[PDB]
Symmetry: D2
Subunit: 386 residues, 4 copies
């Protein structure tokens, strides 16, 4: 009847989707079209490119899963973020943003927005008082991400939402790392959720895309102004269909990701060659109790520091046999990276250190393989490297 009444796994499978009325086709048809035709001049005037039946199913599903009114699919995670913020802000406006944010978001906030006259203050969002202190009469948006790279620190969504709203601003939360299966920011008072569906929501490492979920009034503006008149970042219907297909298994995937990650995190925490393990599922995590209230599962991502700094981390990732060396996350395969030797290699060491990137830090996206195989591969590479 109404998918919003059913359990979350049922919603994952069914919400936004129904057998095709005209054919009975169970799969959502791929409306790979650019042209829609009218039956008459009158129907043409009535209807008056920005929508599509396949993409509509994905948007409605994600709106159900995040408990939001409406969804809007985009060409990429970054396009979800910029379509949102460029819809909301204009010259002279202000944004308060977490500092521990995903890389590409940072360049948009630190360079692109100020060149359009939109100023951004960066703060440590694990300290809600820093958010409050940075707000200005011009502040339209508080922007946060939780958990946050590179040490999986957290932000208290409900507390920050209350602060933002008291001072008249919207709260936008990037929920990519968690997916709606593990965290629901709108239920905690956020106004707008954005995702890179490139990660867990699609989950199969073969789609670049984004989604925005929020109130119908905002989503209509993000669609008819943000996409239409600013970014042009529409998602293709085939990408929407693949994401619909991937998200069918979101519940069973996240359960296995997190079950595997907890096993691996406990193994790493017991290993004498590993100095630190960052994982919200470990009781030693600095914000463990907050994570238990805010997150239904601790997630599939782990960071850890290997003994011996830069050269040990390089030797470790060059010694894995099953884990794949890559910079993405949320795929069915386990992915590993060593930022100080890979992504941030030209960055000055003390500059890396301020960003929380130590020479020995390894980031791991835990996949769906047998956890014993992942652990044996990690142990093999750690033993050789140290």
């Amino acid at each position: 009847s109404d998918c919003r009444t059913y359990g979350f796994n049922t919603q994952i499978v069914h919400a936004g989707q129904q057998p095709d009325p005209s054919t009975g086709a169970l799969s959502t048809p791929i409306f790979q079209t650019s042209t829609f035709v009218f039956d008459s001049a009158e129907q043409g005037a009535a209807r008056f490119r920005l929508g599509n039946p396949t993409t509509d199913a994905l948007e409605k599903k994600l709106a159900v899963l995040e408990r939001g009114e409406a969804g809007l699919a985009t060409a990429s995670g970054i396009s979800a973020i910029t379509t949102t913020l460029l819809t909301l802000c204009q010259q002279g406006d202000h944004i308060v943003s977490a500092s521990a944010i995903y890389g590409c978001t940072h360049a948009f906030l630190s360079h692109s927005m100020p060149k359009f006259g939109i100023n951004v203050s960066f703060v440590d969002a694990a300290k809600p008082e820093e958010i409050r202190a940075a707000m200005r009469p011009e502040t339209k948006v508080v922007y946060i991400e939780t958990p946050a790279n590179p040490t999986l620190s957290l932000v208290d969504i409900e507390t920050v939402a209350g602060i933002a709203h008291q001072q008249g601003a919207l709260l936008v939360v990037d929920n990519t790392f968690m997916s709606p299966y593990c965290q629901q920011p709108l239920q905690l008072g956020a106004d707008i959720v954005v995702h890179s569906v490139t990660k867990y929501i699609n989950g199969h490492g073969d789609v670049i895309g984004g989604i925005i979920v929020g109130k119908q009034e905002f989503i209509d503006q993000a669609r008819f102004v943000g996409l239409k008149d600013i970014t042009g970042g529409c998602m293709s219907p085939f990408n929407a269909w693949l994401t619909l297909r991937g998200v069918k298994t979101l519940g069973i995937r996240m359960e296995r990701h997190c079950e595997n990650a907890l096993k691996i995190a406990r193994f790493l925490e017991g290993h004498p060659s590993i100095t630190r393990v960052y994982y919200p599922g470990l009781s030693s995590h600095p914000q463990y109790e907050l994570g238990q209230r805010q997150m239904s599962l601790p997630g599939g991502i782990i960071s850890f520091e290997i003994a011996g700094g830069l050269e040990a981390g390089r030797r470790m990732i060059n010694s894995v046999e099953l884990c794949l060396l890559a910079v993405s996350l949320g795929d069915t395969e386990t992915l590993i990276q060593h930022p100080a030797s890979m992504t941030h290699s030209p960055v000055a060491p003390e500059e890396r250190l301020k960003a929380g990137i130590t020479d020995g830090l390894i980031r791991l996206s835990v996949g769906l393989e047998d956890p014993e195989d992942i652990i044996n591969d990690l142990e093999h590479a750690i033993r050789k490297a140290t």
Copy 2:
């Protein structure tokens, strides 16, 4: 050897493409991936999401066809335009734009850009002196489209390029209506060409996408700043593969589109119920000789005015049996629309008139059907309507 030496039809088929080195596959493989993997930490540091082998083939092909250095594919035609202009301009900059431009472009220029502190002057670009008179010390870009809706007026690309360059600005040309088969703005001095590949370049009515062609130095900025840090408007690999597939037949398609359109335009010009016909292939076109120098073919689009104004135009499009009522163009099917009753129905009549949209104006995108069938359908509907 080098595709840039071959004839244009040969380039259309082959440029940017080669059998897959590892498999011999003739078709460009669809690299429908989000994740690329490294063989070592060292290879990861060396390579250091924004590129893809399938999309690279499309970009290289269109660069060859427009005689530009480099190409950049995007999520939509509008994203090609906004990624370009938001890469080039910042708060305090100025753009001189033609007034006769495509609708969505107009909203971006008239509302979005000024809200980022980027001012835009709109001029009649058929009068190059109006472009010169509007230029300011702050002008970074002159933006033109030719032919231009809704009466297929022209802009003299070589003359405007000279004006723009003397005053230190770049010339950006939207070449969507023509395709590189019929017009090559970079060869006439433009700096940057943008397309909606949604129209003729894909040609099959099943892809929304854009492309940008220009100097390598600019394209690198449009990719690594514009797409990465502003619009996020990446094209999906499947959309790139479909566009590669569609553009294989660009030469034979444009030849047939234009051969059909000239037959239809001559028929309409002989019909006593049609007051005006706008088509660059007719000697009565106000800028006919300019079109003959600048365009290799007169294009596949026709506008015409039917006797009897609004109600005759409505009755005519409600009487076609083969032409399809739609607002897009460049498809293999003939498409027809009556703006005053369809798209611009809520717009005040005198406001439509300033935009060149008379009550009886019909726009026709001529397809690949037998021209005798298209003409008989038009004659049938015109006879009934008048």
Copy 3:
């Protein structure tokens, strides 16, 4: 190193796949091509349409999962079956087949094979002595399916394999209902396994296809004679890529299917309006202990009989709100059907009864929804119907 050494979930994710050597693309590229090109006359002679790199990955993966030497993908489950049997048999040969087999297989065996001079004896394969008694000097193949429609009866694979081999025949097992995650017939002595990947292996209700797994020597004949010279039933590369994508989640899907099915089967067995429940996970199943040895999980399919015969079964399936009425199985959505009112409606009642299809029999393909929601939907419809 070698995927055949890793755990089964690891094999599911990784076997047959590797990052693209030339690009590092993690996803298997979609080699949607018909033409492969040679670098020289000599390379053309050396290579001398029937293979494809995408489909090869799927074939190698399924060979690993079934512990067979080689795999061969096909256009449909039925094409996997007929390509196999038409490769093995010629005029004058004989097949012993189970009677409890899937419908389309039955028409091929009962009408098509005898018209090619290949005789077929149908037996009750739950009684291995009936298989032995039916074998002839001409028998090339024993053909079985387990579990088998419509009451989920079983066939003892290891015992039948021994009988077939002693009498010089091959054993072919249709393993569609189980998938390699739950049953491995080659490990029990079968020679050839066939699947409809349309069901669990793809799992997403959007691919029709088949696969054959067996010895390299047989698979080479099925490919170069069966596909090339008899059925022409090649799988398309896009279908292979979608099946590769679907099978990534086979392990977590089958676990959830079977966990849900056991909950639902126990609910049905406790319901006083349900006269019988057929499910290998219930201790009351006639061959329960055999299933425990032969199957790692009891599967995702349930049959049950509702009180009140034909009209109660019709009223029940017309009263479900979440379960979808369909004749397929193995999808992420729960599917339900009532054969006596749907598929077998024109079949005479006593003829249905011999086929094990009683008037009240309902078949259920349990999906990935919350089991509480499926149970509540079944209870709702059962209460109304009875």
Copy 4:
């Protein structure tokens, strides 16, 4: 109104297709589904896997283009041929077949059919009297292909149809080489047309598939018995959608293929290093006048013999720079092959000679490139080789 009344180019674009009634989508949606759902038990019984709305559009289009009642899409050209003949024939039946037939067809007819008790007589179908002399009381089918490899000899369809029908047999014509744009065997009295759509009908070198066109009564048997109960050779919906997309340009493609081929054939006929040129468009072709009556265009394929036999042919194909070495045909790229050094290299020379394959024979599939570029490439390689 009715597409069967319109011109052939109009039919190519429109036949079998219409805007989606429920959405107005112009492109045929890709119904990439395996499962169709019923609204009630009653609708399930009424409807009672073998059909699909996307594939139905392709089948209806090709039926219009060949002037047949009905169409049936298949997994491959060979599957179109074997599904047809295995539907029509059973043990004890007879087929008269041309000897000059495509390779894979030959293995099916010469080895597979006799092993099912279906005998085949091979004759020179350019001599209709040999067809008559081979007919038997048991003959169900006469099977021909025209033009035929490797020298592009012809078969008189109308004359052979009359012979077959007088003796009570059906005529099946493989029309792959021509496409319906250039030859219409049903209009000349054939009963059934088969195609590999892998060649010209799709035309883009990225689909393997087949089609069958004939009377509704036969097509129903080919679908519900041949596909369902014998070959299982269904076409996937995505392959059908790609073929629908490719065939949109069939008319303009065949015109350009044939215009280019005639230019190239005349060039080759003037070249003193080329001993023979086989092309139906040359007046020296042995059956030229028959081709003029039976074919609307002479086709896009050329065979020719280069001076100097085996080593000259090898050196020539190793010296082309634009033509691609491949064994397929009908693609947008020009393809070339030298059978005696490539495909038939292990075949004994005198055995090749009986098959019409001389040591110097080159086969050329003329593409859509500029003909001057193709001619210059051929001249370059011919000059070097001789």
